[PDB]
Structure formats: structure tokens, C-alpha cells
Scaffold this active site. Sequence first.
Site, PDB file in Angstrom:
ATOM      1  CG  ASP A  28      -4.216 -10.851  -5.363  1.00 51.99           C
ATOM      2  OD1 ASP A  28      -3.482 -11.793  -5.733  1.00 51.99           O
ATOM      3  OD2 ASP A  28      -3.830  -9.958  -4.572  1.00 51.99           O
ATOM      4  CG  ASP A 138      -5.207 -10.761   3.191  1.00 51.68           C
ATOM      5  OD1 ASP A 138      -6.189 -11.437   3.542  1.00 51.68           O
ATOM      6  OD2 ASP A 138      -5.218  -9.927   2.255  1.00 51.68           O
TER       7      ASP A 138
END
Length: 179
Positions: A28, A138
Site C-alpha cells: 500500500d 499481513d
Amino acid sequence: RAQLCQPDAHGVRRFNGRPCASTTRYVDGHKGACGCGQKGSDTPFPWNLQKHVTAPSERYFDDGGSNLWCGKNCGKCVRLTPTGGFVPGKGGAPPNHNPVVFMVTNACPINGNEEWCGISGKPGTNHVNSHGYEVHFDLQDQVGQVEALHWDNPEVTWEEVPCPGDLQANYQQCECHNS
Ligand SMILES: OC[C@H]1O[C@@H](O[C@H]2[C@H](O)[C@@H](O)[C@H](O)O[C@@H]2CO)[C@H](O)[C@@H](O)[C@@H]1O
Ligand SMILES: OC[C@H]1O[C@@H](O[C@H]2[C@H](O)[C@@H](O)[C@H](O)O[C@@H]2CO)[C@H](O)[C@@H](O)[C@@H]1O
């Protein structure tokens, strides 16, 4: 039976006495919830895009709290060891089970991550995600570092470990160090 960690009497998936975690990968570009970039920007340090770094599910990130900035477990390291398992249709069996150490530098909030990070208590409280794991990691994959492991959302066993010296030194420049 693609998941090899069996739920215990309290629903927590375990393997050979050890707690399991699910994993995913993410990209991201954000600095992240531990402030591992220059103060006041949303620019991560390159090492925080390149190295073995993770955004754990929220309740582990903040040791039971809801803080998404300088969580209590920022800068901790976890050793993740594949079991050979995975969630059917949402991962695969990795080519090897070499363990990898990741440093916590970001958070996977419950909001927007129900399936994997929707865990309503910290490890030790027998709260699990939708797949039966007490915690989720994650894994940052900006530069393909998770692809280079050939990890496709592997099931792992997890433990906190002292950080390797290079990661400990990296963390010393994050804003959350000694918060
Ligand atoms: O919500 C956590 C994390 O999920 C990542 O997507 C997963 C997806 O849920 C799963 O079905 C598929 O098999 O694997 C992908 C990649 O791990 C998503 O890429 C992340 O942005 C997100 O933080
Ligand atoms: O990027 C700095 C910013 O991080 C916020 O955490 C986000 C993170 O940016 C994002 O990568 C991840 O997917 O979600 C977390 C939590 O929402 C943090 O909450 C901010 O305080 C911080 O300014």
C-alpha cells in the site's frame, strides 16, 4: 483438510503445542502505524518497504487495545514457520518450511479486514478470526519479498523472538520507538 492446525477446545488452531497464525500479503506504500518513516510524512523508510515486516491484526498490534498509532507491539519480532497448511481456496502449500522473522511495523485494522483481522481479543483470550486463528500477520510485499519466499498465504506457527540486530537498528528510527 488443507489447514493443518487443529482447533483446540477453545477454538484456537494449534500445531504440535504451538499457536498458529494465518498470513496474507499486502502492498500500500504507506508509512504505517509504527511511524517507520520521516515524521509528519506518509513516506516509509525504504527498509520498511523492502524487509521482512508485518502488519498484524489489530488486537495483537496493540496488545488488546484499539490504538492504530504506536501500538504496544510495534517493533516486536515474530518468527513464522510454515506448517504446509493454508485456507482452501485462499492460499497454497509453500515449497519449503524455512522459518522467517518479521518485525511489526504496521497494523491490520479490524475495519476493512474482517475475514483475516477480525479478531476481537488478543492472543491468549481464545478469540479467533473467521478461519480459526488467534492472530493474523499481513506481510509487506512491496518489493516482492513475500513472492521471493513463495508464500501464498501459508498457515504458520508463530512466536515472538528477539529482533535481529539489523531490524532492531531500523526500528530505532521509527517514531514509535520509546513512545
Ligand atoms: O485483509 C488482509 C489482506 O488481504 C489481502 O488479500 C488476500 C485475500 O484476502 C485472499 O483471499 C487471497 O487469497 O490472498 C490475498 C493476498 O494475501 C490483501 O492483498 C491485503 O491488502 C489485505 O490487507
Ligand atoms: O501511514 C501512517 C499512518 O498509518 C496508519 O496506519 C494505517 C497504515 O497506514 C496502513 O498501511 C494500514 O493498512 O492500516 C493502518 C491502520 O489504519 C496510522 O493509523 C496513522 O496513525 C498513521 O498516521
